[PDB]
Design a protein around this ligand. Structure first.
Ligand SMILES: Cc1cc(CCCCCCCOc2ccc(C3=NCCO3)cc2)on1
Ligand SMILES: Cc1cc(CCCCCCCOc2ccc(C3=NCCO3)cc2)on1
Lengths: 40, 243, 239, 297, 297, 239, 243, 49, 40
């Protein structure tokens, strides 16, 4: 981001964000299923 | 003024450039962000979700029959049940999957995959299967004699109704291509076969013929590069407001 | 922790024995609207026990050739009880939904149901350019029937329907499914008579079947939906 | 939520024969994706991966300039015995569903919030008349003005709604670099909705079409040739490319499989045969036991 | 490995008559290059060299813009009674062996890893018809789009694969400076291979050609005239120049001596007579004792 | 240090007396694949003694008009012993090669052999546009014969063939040659039945000759190749 | 805006420029480097390797005979054996060499060279040669009487089968040109001659006629400048996918 | 000179741009401000009347 | 190297590296041959 203009939305592509939370789609279960154990 | 020379590449419009642009609405105030569940940060989060695949992709099954697989009580032993090609680029069971659809936007892929098979019989139906991933190089195994030598997992039905087989990353190169020549070294991934291990046994009161539902996804070590226009959807003219 | 479960909301209490777990949509639990995200300035009404309770919808029979059923929320509950009354007397609404699907079969029966909660589910009809009518889309608690469960009536694929929050009712190990859904809108509130946030779809992936003594078994499928954290704004006359 | 600069590494494993531990067995009925790790599912070694994941981000997945409009119109004398209308202009009724690739990548997610960079590329041609001679293309001036909802729509080239006293407009030439500007996130809601399961009006009539979002009234784009008509007829083709930036995506969708038929709804007719047929998305193979691409030696 | 800013210096020497020391004698049978230094092979003085070695680096040897493509096509009306195809475009089937000089400098090394800067220079002409008049060249818009492996190939100028929603494309004019961009190192392996002693497919058929690398499937370059056809016929010649950067080279080769005959393999037919003949790479001289360039006084 | 040498690998042990030295290709010694450079995730098999040993190939007679011979690795050893068996049962492989060339002649004989290890050696045939067939390229341990040793069958020059690792067998002072070759690929592993990394070429630079009593002397040339640090991945059935 | 004036040289495409360019693939992740043996950093590393040369470049030798030189048991004394021109630019023995091929990409060269001659006779064959480098200025020496006066090395056959002669950098100018006029001062390097010193002696059992193999390379003080398109390889049309 | 590339959007006239421009009257001295009642700073002050 | 762009591979020609190891091609022998001595 360099953003030569006054408005902040006029900037270039946003700085890279590598945060990943696949659980919300891969383990969306209230009771966490422990790995290596019978998950029933 | 400042000394200046226009280099080659000036006055060009590159669709992948990253530059700031003049704001059309000065001092505009956007709507404040509101927390919405299910925010996606990377395409790799969606290829890790389960997705059923069309194993029964024959010219006899219409619709949902193609997402489910015949499983029979056998009068013989060591018989092959079904095959799964691993050609995501070409027309196969793995194309219409989250993993497949998303990775078909890209050209290079890497990393191990996983397949989950769920048994949908009756509670009294018992059985044993063997699922084998065979690395490429030769023909598809037809007998369990040759299939057992490659990677394999023995699945026994019980309280846990689904099994998972990991297709590991066995490749000389770091990445593989979604090439139209699925028969080439850079594109071929391997073979998946299912063999009955002992038999499928069901009582008289239970339905003799059961089904397997197959699903495929990626693991944490999956990577994609060189994203491209997918051949999934096409266009012949500008879409009107009519039929 | 076990396969047993009890969901007790208000006067309603559902006990299930052959369950799997509780699926929270996108790993979230419905909550009341906070001040920093609120838009309407008058106080919303929050009737907890009178609305946040289980409403049981009318059952469907599972047939061997069943294609699937769908219920649009909050349309299914817009005509029922205090939730429906508060929807009718108010302009704006906001609530999550806890959906519980019942399907009882013997251990000799086989069959698999996929219970998928599709957000913002626009129904696309096939072989026509005309958009779906009000009668076809807004069906209330009586529900809808899938023309093409293979395509989810959207032009999409049932195979890729696992991005959405989902449960499997597999007769070997399950008879009930539970999915918890938070608020799904780009806005804090909306108008109930003209927009649906969620669509609960039950699609039989594997047909119901039995062997030589269990064919043609009348097996119903029941839907119980519980609003949670329901707020209503814009009090007026009923419409 | 954890930071993932590179994909996960692999650790070495040994023989595993323990009672009560079944990593390969999973209960997908719970709705949870199988967590069976490759390390203890099979016999693995130590592998360290430097493979980056930056290109798999939604920032790079969507922040890539894609065509969203292409209008071609005649630039000539449209006057007749009594017309008094030049009509050397076009309106677009702003939307992002006319091109199937960008539309599909929009509809891979339920909600999208982004500020869009817009590029306009004009091209000229001469109409091939009975007696036409070409030795050059004029450097015409073009005005592209965004008309928001409820504002006046120009009715001709010489109309006086082109003052642009408040409406933002951009003036650019054919030979100049293609015009470029930025639209901020301009939805009345917190995000754009690719799907709207409902109606945009309070009415119960058939006039209110299902699926129309009462937040997608994006406005209009009125593009005009500033220069008056020429003695000979030309044709102008304007291509508008849209590039999302500062993107957040919510609730990923099921990918679209069938060809789009229109922009008002997501109806589909299906293709005659597989692949992507009504009953057959994936093409047929011989049987479930045949391999269509068998390597035979 | 030592840093060599300038070539080695020379030190002064004296008379050397010692038993058991034979610097001039070498055993090349060991495979080692003779190490006989000039200082003690002959009678030398002290010479200090400031001669730089920067231009002899592989960075400067290869990092120099070279032509790798030249396609010429007709820009006109290609429509007929029933054609519906404009075909004002070309595909290249991306490779770097069509030009012999750049090909030879590629094949001076076994392995090369570099990011390449690509420059596209277009040129226009009018076709000389029976009745043609020229007084200027139009400033046409050209779109060059890279289509990776397995992606769709456009079939016409008016085709809809030119959306470039994901495929990177560059738009440039004739009168603008030549287009320029950068391709990163895009091989599935750690380096590009100029030679592949093997087959790219698992097959044993004759269809699999020897020497094809299953890592050289570079993709395609689809270049189109964005402007529609003109009333009169033109010809467009596009030259693509390739410049390596960030270069590492491995396992230097034997230089190519014979003219190339094709791009699929390194077969050769040889020239009729010396030099570079099949039996005669260097031209003949009279005898081994004659000097062909004798300075006679 | 002297002209004598002993190479002892596994059960094999070669002693040479009129040697020159050991040529390590590019000054490197073959090693096992490290973790930071590994790609395949399953463990590779590393049979040390059963595969890392000297395999002696079938000999060629040195004639006065001999043009030269070439062996492609690992094709020459793909049909022999545990190395061949592990190649057949596995998809991916990685190994260096120690090549030893034997050529015995009397002190009255003259002749010089250049033993050059060419990496990634693409054979180019002459007077034809057709690429070389599978039969002509993949020759196994039986080896190949140079059409144009002057051009290395590549369009290159034999004169410039000294960039590649090389030995000279000069009958005055040598009878054996030794070259050590590490892994030569842009990838950590490859497929053996479809690609060869190294080509060992023995080209007679000076013809074999003798004076008045040593003409027509039957002098064989022997090749012994030892795999080193062999790894195999992707276990499956034999092909 | 910033004051600016476009200098001459703007909008030009120079094939030797050094400027950054717009990346076509944003945030692309290249394959990690893997250690490969034989990495080359400079062109000067390859000109220092030995390379045989075509001394027998006459219209009687076909192929490998041209890389090897007749050596005879003489019935006379002081006779010249062979000559070597040092015109790398023109058609001579030194062109088809690593040194020659690489330096022919450049225009100016400097530094001393080395020649190694290997004897390929029988172990019982003895002999003495003298190899003389003569600086330019006059004609090629024909008799040893004149050849001994220039730079020379006496080679005696024995356990060491190869000899090395250094051609030193004897030039008024710092560099020399690969000029098509090999007869000019800036281009001429000198002469190389081989004379029998005593004789070539072989027993009756050994072959009477032996061979020398000649090789040339550069030393550590070798330099090249003004790289150019080599006249080694040519082209008349774009190379097709056919014959 | 300074390396330079003209990006898309060059040579364009956007009616909502915010850039400095060449002064036509150099060193011009404007009339000093005089306090005038009823100064408006925002459009939102008038919609409240 | 100035590299006005985000990606590092978009930079200009790499900084000069004058490291030279001709031995790997000129003396690729396990036993080092000392200069001025019989190398056998
Ligand atoms: C889903 C969804 C996503 C969106 C975003 C649509 C905005 C992008 C559409 C393309 C923008 O088109 C414009 C072209 C030009 C101008 C311009 N303004 C000043 C002069 O021209 C504005 C918009 O809407 N619904
Ligand atoms: C050996 C060896 C070396 C290589 C590298 C080949 C890459 C360089 C070939 C020339 C690149 O051609 C292109 C031209 C234009 C574009 C471009 N991408 C976006 C718009 O146009 C891309 C590549 O492959 N094998």
């Amino acid at each position: 981001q360099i953003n030569f203009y006054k408005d902040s939305y006029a900037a270039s592509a946003s700085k890279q964000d590598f945060s990943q939370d696949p659980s919300k789609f891969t383990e969306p279960v209230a009771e966490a299923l422990k790995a290596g154990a019978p998950v029933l | 003024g400042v000394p200046t020379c226009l280099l080659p590449g000036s006055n060009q419009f590159l669709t992948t450039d990253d530059h700031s642009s003049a704001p059309a609405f000065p001092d505009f105030s956007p709507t404040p962000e509101m927390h919405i569940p299910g925010q996606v940060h990377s395409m790799l989060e969606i290829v890790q979700i389960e997705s059923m695949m069309e194993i029964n992709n024959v010219n006899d099954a219409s619709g949902v029959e193609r997402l489910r697989v015949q499983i029979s009580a056998q009068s013989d032993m060591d018989q092959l049940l079904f095959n799964i090609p691993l050609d995501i680029q070409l027309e196969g069971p793995l194309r219409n999957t989250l993993l497949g659809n998303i990775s078909r936007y890209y050209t290079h892929w890497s990393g191990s995959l996983e397949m989950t098979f769920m048994f949908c019989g009756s509670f009294m139906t018992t059985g044993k299967l063997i699922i084998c991933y065979t690395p490429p190089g030769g023909s598809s195994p037809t007998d369990r004699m040759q299939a057992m030598l490659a990677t394999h997992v023995v699945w026994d039905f019980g309280l846990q109704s689904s099994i998972t087989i990991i297709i590991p990353w066995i490749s000389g190169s770091h990445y593989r291509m979604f090439n139209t020549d699925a028969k080439a070294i850079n594109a071929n991934v391997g073979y998946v076969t299912c063999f009955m291990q002992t038999n499928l046994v069901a009582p008289v009161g239970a339905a003799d013929q059961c089904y397997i539902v197959g699903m495929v996804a990626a693991k944490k070590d999956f990577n994609l590069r060189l994203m491209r226009d997918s051949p999934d959807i096409g266009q012949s003219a500008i879409l009107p407001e009519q039929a | 922790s076990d396969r047993v479960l009890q969901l007790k909301l208000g006067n309603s209490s559902i006990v299930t024995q052959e369950a799997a777990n509780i699926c929270c949509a996108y790993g979230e639990w419905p909550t009341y609207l906070p001040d920093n995200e609120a838009v309407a300035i008058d106080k919303p009404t929050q009737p907890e026990t009178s609305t946040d309770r289980f409403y049981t919808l009318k059952s469907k029979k599972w047939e061997s050739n069943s294609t699937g059923w769908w219920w649009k929320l909050p349309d299914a509950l817009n005509q029922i009880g205090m939730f429906g009354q508060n929807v009718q007397y108010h302009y704006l609404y906001r609530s999550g939904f806890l959906c519980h699907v019942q399907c009882n079969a013997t251990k000799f029966h086989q069959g698999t149901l996929l219970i998928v909660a599709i957000p913002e589910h626009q129904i696309g009809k096939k072989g026509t350019g005309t958009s779906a009518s009000f009668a076809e889309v807004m069906k209330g608690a009586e529900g809808g029937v899938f023309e093409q469960p293979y395509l989810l009536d959207d032009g999409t694929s049932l195979a890729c329907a696992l991005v959405y929050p989902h449960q499997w009712i597999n007769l070997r190990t399950n008879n009930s499914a539970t999915i918890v859904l938070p608020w799904m809108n780009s806005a804090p509130m909306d108008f109930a008579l003209r927009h649906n946030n969620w669509t609960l779809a039950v699609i039989p992936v594997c047909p119901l079947a039995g062997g030589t003594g269990n064919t043609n078994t009348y097996v119903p499928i029941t839907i119980s939906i519980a609003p949670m954290c329901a707020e209503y704004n814009g009090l007026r006359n009923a419409i | 939520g954890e930071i993932v600069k590179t994909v996960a590494n692999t650790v070495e494993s040994e023989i595993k024969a323990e009672l009560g531990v079944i990593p390969s067995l999973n209960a997908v009925e719970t709705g949870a994706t199988s967590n069976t790790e490759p390390e203890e599912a099979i016999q693995t070694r130590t592998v360290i991966n430097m493979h980056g994941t930056a290109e798999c981000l939604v920032e790079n997945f969507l922040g890539r300039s894609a065509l969203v409009c292409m209008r071609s119109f005649e630039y000539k004398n449209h006057s007749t015995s009594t017309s008094s209308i030049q009509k050397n202009f076009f309106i677009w009724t702003l939307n992002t569903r006319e091109l199937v690739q960008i539309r599909r990548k929009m509809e891979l997610f339920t909600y999208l919030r982004f500020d869009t960079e817009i590029t306009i590329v004009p091209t000229l041609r001469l109409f091939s008349s009975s007696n036409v001679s070409f030795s050059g293309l004029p450097n015409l001036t073009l005005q592209a003005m965004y008309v928001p909802t409820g504002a006046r729509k120009p009715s001709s080239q010489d109309s006086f709604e082109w003052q642009s006293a408040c409406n933002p407009s951009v003036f650019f030439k054919i030979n100049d670099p293609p015009a470029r500007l930025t639209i901020p996130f301009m939805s009345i809601n917190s995000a754009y909705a690719n799907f709207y399961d409902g109606f945009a009006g309070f009415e119960k009539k058939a006039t209110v079409l299902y699926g129309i979002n009462p937040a997608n009234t994006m406005g209009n784009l009125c593009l005009r040739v500033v220069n008056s008509y020429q003695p000979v007829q030309y044709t102008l083709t304007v291509r508008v490319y849209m590039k999302p930036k500062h993107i957040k995506a919510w609730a990923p969708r099921a990918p679209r499989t069938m060809p789009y038929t229109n922009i008002l709804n997501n109806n589909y007719a299906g293709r005659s045969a597989a692949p992507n047929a009504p009953t057959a998305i994936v093409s047929h193979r011989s049987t479930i036991k045949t391999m269509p691409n068998d390597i035979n030696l």
